[PDB]
Ligand binder design. Structure first.
Ligand SMILES: *[C@@H]1O[C@H](CO)[C@@H](O[C@@H]2O[C@H](CO)[C@@H](O)[C@H](O)[C@H]2NC(C)=O)[C@H](O)[C@H]1NC(C)=O
Ligand SMILES: *[C@@H]1O[C@H](CO)[C@@H](O[C@@H]2O[C@H](CO)[C@@H](O)[C@H](O)[C@H]2NC(C)=O)[C@H](O)[C@H]1NC(C)=O
Ligand SMILES: *[C@@H]1O[C@H](CO)[C@@H](O[C@@H]2O[C@H](CO)[C@@H](O)[C@H](O)[C@H]2NC(C)=O)[C@H](O)[C@H]1NC(C)=O
Ligand SMILES: *[C@@H]1O[C@H](CO)[C@@H](O[C@@H]2O[C@H](CO)[C@@H](O)[C@H](O)[C@H]2NC(C)=O)[C@H](O)[C@H]1NC(C)=O
Ligand SMILES: *[C@@H]1O[C@H](CO)[C@@H](O)[C@H](O)[C@H]1NC(C)=O
Ligand SMILES: *[C@@H]1O[C@H](CO)[C@@H](O)[C@H](O)[C@H]1NC(C)=O
Ligand SMILES: *[C@@H]1O[C@H](CO)[C@@H](O)[C@H](O)[C@H]1NC(C)=O
Ligand SMILES: *[C@@H]1O[C@H](CO)[C@@H](O)[C@H](O)[C@H]1NC(C)=O
Ligand SMILES: *[C@@H]1O[C@H](CO)[C@@H](O)[C@H](O)[C@H]1NC(C)=O
Ligand SMILES: *[C@@H]1O[C@H](CO)[C@@H](O)[C@H](O)[C@H]1NC(C)=O
Ligand SMILES: *[C@@H]1O[C@H](CO)[C@@H](O)[C@H](O)[C@H]1NC(C)=O
Ligand SMILES: *[C@@H]1O[C@H](CO)[C@@H](O)[C@H](O)[C@H]1NC(C)=O
Lengths: 801, 801
């Protein structure tokens, strides 16, 4: 008995009766807002695909009271990456799912259960996989609970080992070590590899509580038989089953598809249904066509959300009504949704679209039919567009209106010639009436043919640009003339005319010998700016020949400057005599980075250190709201007055020509290094390369270099004394601070500390006044990185004579 | 020798010579980017007002090498709340300022000094005050340093006590305990209370290294003498000194002012200079006038940053040139800067200001003179404003143009009547020429007198509004008529016409018996919306009488709905039988909150707990990227299908009529409580009050309620046994889990555990088979909150007979 494709039980506590016969729940399960007021127990349920959710169920004390035999929660579809959600469950004392074995996908969210115990008593690491992403907060604190399993087994949690159980009467069932990844029966006999959870009988396909791969005819098959297909994620159905499945009712709702041996709702991305609503998907070349079908016969695009419904459509079975009064970046936003619409089965009406200066956002639209036409047989109908300068009718575009006429009225900024060129490609020359296209109220303010403004000279700095164009006499002697400079930051040249354009109005100079120009104030160094000037011809005599002047879009890049310091210098040592160091490109390069120049200087071993007698110390040293961005900016501004011109310890200098990583070679092991890193550019040979962002790093210690390189010698001396002599390590890791002699008669119990200064005087150490007998001794040098290895024992005797 | 008002030594290491004679540095001190290559030592310097900054000084090993006698850094003005910044100082080993005593204001920033030791050896808690906000990161790690003071005193850092010193040769100077807040000489004789730091001689005004209040004539005065004034924050100067001080050169730079006995740069907020540039400030009523003076004779307002310079000005000594092509919210942003400008000494030119539909942002502007006028004697000159519908010339405003004419041209949306009404208040009737104001190219598209659209019916839901207005026959029979509905969320009624307005175009219905209306889709419940309809009259016959239709701004509020759950319920217990609980108003009230309704239910003491024998246990219980907002939203949507209609343990119910806080009375001490909190509204008596956001809280334990209420009695029993009998605590804190008997012959060494179930059987405990002798015994009850007090000893004997 499969139940689905989704159970949502809420409010009525009696509504839980829908689970009387369900053994598997295909899809999620929701038990919400239940107020229990006899009990309900469902031992039939064992498997739940997708997730299980519980929320605000009053009266329920344990989950075992409802689903005691629940074994596998597949989590095929998750509730926000959660396969089990127990949230705000009052009166609930424990997760009584003592038969739960495997949660195949997702995490667990257990939250806000003031009486929920037996949380730490469950080893979730063996029932699910992603234990790290589990969410168990806000439950009953373990300090005030009292978990006590009846009296079973136990295992390791972190470094702790404690008992495991689900409730106060049942323990956590586990499988023996011999089955490995397989499952086991209650009697601990291994279950068939394709099984999952428990077994009605050991090693049998038809005796499984839940299959781990797929299910068909009572058998746990790895893959579906040849004539069956994967449905959901656990069972196999035949072809006649998915020909009867229907998706959620929508405007373009259809049946399910068979693809890649799976029976899914829609064809996946990059696939389209073969034939006419057939059951199979065919690979579609490049972009796959999505025909959009809507209930409303005339789709009205009056906002930005209305256009979102036409996103990615290739053909529109309906009528388009554009009505866009407001909108700033809609010219490029509509092109995201409607830029792929190619065919319109009906008519297109551009009414009251004051925000549209052009129709270029309707790219790829090459076919308009005329299945339904506006009153009077019209397939293209624009009206009252106070800013429509041009159509999408560039001479590159293609268009074909099958049937209908075109009506144009009250579009003042649209040149009347542009709509005569439309019916050329449209193919409706002479099909319209005499009033459909009228020079009155259309093209009244249109400035069609314009002149050309020619730039004359440009001068660049690192932040200023001076540009001058030729004087422009207006077409009529009586026109008042003024200019308007449009300039904006354009990283590359493909620029559309006015938009985040910066505008300034400069007047024609009074003296006729000087030409009009403009000075730009504060610009970023080495930045390409798109500039073009436009004339303002206020004609006292209107129309006759409305004539403006426009210049070409000139791209001017400012000069380069001193670069910024490299960002976040990090360094490590993977080996002695080697230093790796990485960084990030500077904040303001101001040109082409070209290369980096890095310098490393040896640092002296710390002053003093040689001076102190480290046999007296107890610790010997070793070695291996928020406006702070404005604070650090002040110190970056200081680094402009000092640059770096490239060419006691000396600096070594190397150029890194491409990457932001480099490895330094030939270094003294366990020595500190000052790593100066600069950033130059292509103009840094005259501007000077940038300042330095430096870091300090120490290399790895030379292994085995701080131990005694020779044998220990001994010489008897006055009293009952012995003088141990040993060679000094030539190249220690940093510096040898002290030696330790470990000697004794039977056990090397007596220990003698030999300071560095003591060894420099005598070349060894004198063991003072020993008891007679046979002795052994071991010596160990301690450097700055650490100690070396003990020497092999030296043997000396003190005679009692 | 006072040096200032700011020393900035950088780059040139020889430039440090400017401190040869300075004993006090008035203002900050900057030593940056220095590269030392003989040494420089300045024992003269002792005091530094404001802060001291050091950055990237190579070669310097200790700060004592430069300023050994530096005693007081006043920090009058801070470098971002820092009085001392030592950042990226290479080769620096220690802060050698061994004479530093008091840092009066600010924190310390010591960062990125890889060789800086002697940081933990300094007790900064006695030289500065805000030790919490200090920043000491990125220096030499204390593990690899080796701080060793020569060989002085020591004190407590946190819970540690260690030696204090500045460098390897000098220690941290401190003052004896007898001086308290006062200062001390090197020889530990207390310094005059007005002194600070050290003393040339004990207890003398003229023998101070630094005064703590102020300084004058070699004396540390608390306040300045009557004829002197506070300058900076340490010395007193006479009146003739501040009459010679000049601020930083600006467009309106003047001398300093004397105010409140202090000599400051400008008059403080709420004060203006008396007379004509005098030395004293006078209280100005309400808003204080700020006359703005600029070098550029004609200020050009062509952007949003240019207007920021005119912020708060009352009078403008110059000419205003408005040229605003772009800008959305500039109509209300310009009113922030220019809304207080009242008088303009020159002319005003509104050129190419297409973004301006009105000049209302120039509020309070009531006077325009004419000191300089545009060519042709013009004081008001507008030109080419394609959207200027009206001036700021409301009949409420006042204006007076002293001299000059007014020229109007190429303003199409400006009604020609509006500028005739201007020269009424302006007072220039007949002063202009015949071409200065022309009906041509002015008012060409202006729709002056308009009709009135009347609403007919409105219907409201919780998210939808239907509104219908009367049918409108256009003035001309041949006009095409359409409507445009403007509606936007308006919390209150003061609304300006079109702006974040939502617009939709509805057509006049074909049937003449039905009136035009519109249905609004998804609105917030209980929200006031401003709605008004506007007619679109496309006149086939242009002008004659351009006539539009506009409606009144109708304010419609939607219905109320079920409120949201209260936010973040927190609860605590300040006393037994009392529970305080606070919360936050719901996310979506949907009406007037009116009141809250809270419920508290007693929770039963945990099941079991009574069952276990807690004398065997070892621990007895006690008690006292980020889309999770979308996750929690799903659970808030679930709480709409279940509401609360207001009226084993019973629920107690109380109404909170105003605040979001309440205190529950009459409770059982140390008992858990379920606190259900709902949020109602004025319509919740029919809609139903909202769901509950509940919390659990336990009250305080009843003090002394879990101890024995009577004396202990003993009775001899068979063997050598004793049966101790004691009364049970009537009202324990939660529950008595176990008793402990502490008995012995000479010392109460033997301890007997008495479980709760054992006491229920016998009413006491039997001490089993004791050795003969005299005994004492003490008993203690352990409840859920904790243990009670031991009983006074009971005395019993075991005879050996
Ligand atoms: C629950 O069962 C599933 C499926 O039987 C287990 O999923 C395995 O996940 C690992 C992860 O690398 C894959 O390599 C295996 O191939 C998966 N199994 C199969 C049959 O494909 C999952 O590990 C099980 N979880 C627990 C806790 O036992
Ligand atoms: C900005 O770059 C231009 C070149 O793109 C510089 O003009 C050059 O200036 C040098 C002066 O050292 C002359 O020798 C060259 O002949 C100039 N080249 C051209 C094409 O004019 C200009 O000087 C740079 N700006 C600054 C401030 O250095
Ligand atoms: C350094 O000296 C100043 C001024 O002498 C001290 O400032 C005192 O701050 C407390 C804070 O509550 C005030 O109550 C006192 O009135 C201030 N002193 C005076 C004279 O007004 C500051 O505490 C001193 N810092 C150290 C570390 O001694
Ligand atoms: C929204 O509020 C209006 C009143 O402002 C409601 O209109 C009332 O509806 C009740 C129905 O129970 C009638 O008894 C009243 O006479 C109506 N008053 C008016 C002034 O018309 C309207 O029903 C509310 N909307 C909803 C969905 O309940
Ligand atoms: C469940 O099975 C019973 C028989 O035991 C049957 O009467 C009933 O109709 C089935 N379905 C439901 C929803 O109870
Ligand atoms: C211009 O071209 C570049 C690269 O071809 C592209 O990244 C950018 O989006 C284009 N911009 C426009 C406005 O076409
Ligand atoms: C900077 O780099 C770009 C990209 O490779 C290149 O086109 C340009 O010529 C370079 N500029 C110079 C001055 O080499
Ligand atoms: C340091 O001493 C320990 C002590 O036995 C030794 O194991 C270790 O090898 C020594 N270090 C080196 C580098 O030999
Ligand atoms: C500092 O004092 C000396 C006298 O010791 C004098 O010669 C010099 O001019 C003064 N000023 C400076 C800046 O050195
Ligand atoms: C409307 O008035 C309210 C209160 O008087 C005020 O907070 C708000 O800013 C005003 N808005 C406008 C546009 O005047
Ligand atoms: C809601 O509160 C406001 C503010 O006090 C008040 O003006 C309004 O009348 C109230 N509404 C009702 C229905 O009482
Ligand atoms: C709990 O026992 C300690 C042990 O002496 C005692 O000091 C304390 O007062 C006891 N608690 C109470 C509430 O009496």
């Amino acid at each position: 008995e499969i139940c689905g494709p989704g159970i949502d039980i809420r409010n009525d506590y009696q509504q839980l009766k829908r689970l009387e016969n369900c053994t598997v729940i295909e899809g999620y399960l929701h038990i919400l807002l239940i107020s229990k007021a006899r009990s309900y127990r469902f031992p039939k349920l064992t498997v739940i695909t997708e997730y299980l959710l519980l929320f605000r169920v009053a009266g329920l004390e344990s989950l075992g009271d409802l689903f005691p035999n629940l074994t596998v929660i597949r989590g095929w579809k998750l509730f926000y990456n959660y396969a089990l959600v127990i949230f705000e469950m009052t009166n609930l004392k424990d997760i009584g799912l003592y038969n739960l074995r495997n949660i195949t996908r997702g995490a667990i969210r257990i939250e806000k259960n003031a009486d929920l115990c037996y949380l730490s008593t469950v080893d979730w690491s063996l029932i699910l996989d992603a234990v790290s992403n589990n969410y168990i907060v806000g439950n009953k604190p373990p300090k005030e609970c009292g978990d006590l399993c009846p009296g079973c087994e136990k295992t390791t949690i972190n470094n702790e080992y404690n008992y495991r159980c689900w409730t106060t009467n049942r323990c956590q069932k586990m499988c023996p070590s011999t089955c490995g990844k397989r499952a086991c029966t209650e009697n601990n006999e291994c279950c068939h590899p394709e099984c999952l959870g428990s077994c009605s009988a050991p090693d049998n396909d038809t005796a499984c509580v839940a299959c781990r791969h797929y299910y068909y005819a009572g058998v746990c098959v790895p893959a579906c038989p040849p004539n069956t297909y994967r449905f959901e994620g656990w069972r196999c159905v035949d072809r006649d089953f998915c020909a009867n499945i229907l998706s959620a009712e929508s405007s373009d709702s259809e049946g399910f598809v068979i693809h890649d041996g799976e029976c899914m709702q829609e064809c996946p991305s990059g696939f389209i249904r073969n034939g006419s609503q057939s059951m199979y998907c065919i690979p579609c070349e490049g972009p796959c066509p999505k025909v959009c079908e809507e209930e409303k016969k005339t789709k009205t695009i009056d906002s930005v959300t209305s256009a979102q419904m036409l996103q990615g459509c290739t053909i529109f079975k309906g009528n388009l009504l554009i009505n866009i009064r407001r909108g700033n970046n809609i010219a490029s936003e509509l092109e995201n949704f409607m830029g792929l619409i190619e065919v319109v089965t009906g008519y297109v009406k551009i009414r009251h679209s004051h925000a549209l200066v052009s129709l270029s956002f309707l790219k790829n639209l090459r076919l308009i039919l005329g299945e339904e036409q506006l009153e009077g047989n019209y397939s293209f109908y624009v009206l009252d567009n106070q800013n429509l300068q041009q159509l999408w009718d560039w001479d590159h575009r293609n268009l074909t209106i099958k049937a209908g006429k075109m009506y144009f009225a009250f579009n003042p900024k649209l040149c009347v010639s542009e709509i005569y060129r439309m019916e050329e490609v449209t193919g409706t020359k002479g099909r319209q009436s005499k009033g459909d296209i009228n020079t009155r109220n259309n093209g009244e303010r249109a400035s069609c043919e314009s002149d050309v403004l020619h730039f004359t000279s440009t001068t660049t700095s690192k932040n200023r640009i001076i540009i001058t164009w030729h004087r422009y006499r207006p077409p009529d002697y009586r026109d008042l003339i003024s200019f308007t400079v449009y300039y904006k930051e354009a990283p590359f040249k493909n620029v559309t005319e006015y938009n985040s354009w910066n505008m300034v109005d400069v007047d024609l100079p009074p003296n006729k010998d000087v030409e009009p120009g403009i000075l730009l104030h504060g610009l970023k160094p080495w930045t390409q700016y798109a500039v073009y000037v436009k004339a303002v011809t206020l004609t006292m005599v209107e129309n006759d020949h409305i004539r403006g002047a426009k210049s070409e879009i000139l791209y001017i890049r400012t000069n380069a400057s001193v670069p910024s310091i490299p960002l976040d210098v990090l360094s490590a040592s993977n080996s002695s005599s080697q230093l790796i160091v990485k960084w990030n490109p500077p904040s303001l390069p101001n040109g082409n980075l070209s290369y980096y120049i890095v310098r490393w200087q040896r640092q002296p071993q710390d002053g003093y250190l040689y001076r102190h007698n480290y046999c007296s110390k107890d610790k010997i040293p070793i070695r291996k709201e928020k406006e702070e961005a404005e604070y650090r900016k002040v110190f970056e501004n200081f680094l402009h007055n000092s640059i770096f011109v490239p060419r006691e310890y000396p600096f070594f200098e190397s150029r890194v020509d491409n990457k932001e990583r480099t490895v330094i070679s030939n270094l003294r092991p366990f020595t500190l290094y000052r790593i100066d890193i600069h950033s130059c550019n292509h103009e840094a040979e005259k501007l000077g390369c940038s300042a330095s962002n430096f870091v300090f790093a120490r290399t790895m210690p030379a292994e085995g270099a701080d131990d005694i390189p020779g044998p220990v010698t001994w010489e008897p001396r006055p009293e009952n004394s012995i003088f141990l002599k040993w060679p000094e390590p030539e190249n220690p890791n940093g510096l040898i601070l002290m030696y330790e002699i470990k000697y004794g008669s039977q056990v090397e119990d007596q220990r003698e500390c030999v300071s560095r200064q003591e060894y420099r005087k005598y070349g060894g150490a004198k063991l003072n006044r020993l008891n007679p007998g046979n002795y052994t001794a071991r010596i160990q040098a301690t450097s700055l990185s650490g100690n070396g290895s003990w020497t092999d024992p030296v043997f000396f005797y003190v005679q009692a004579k």
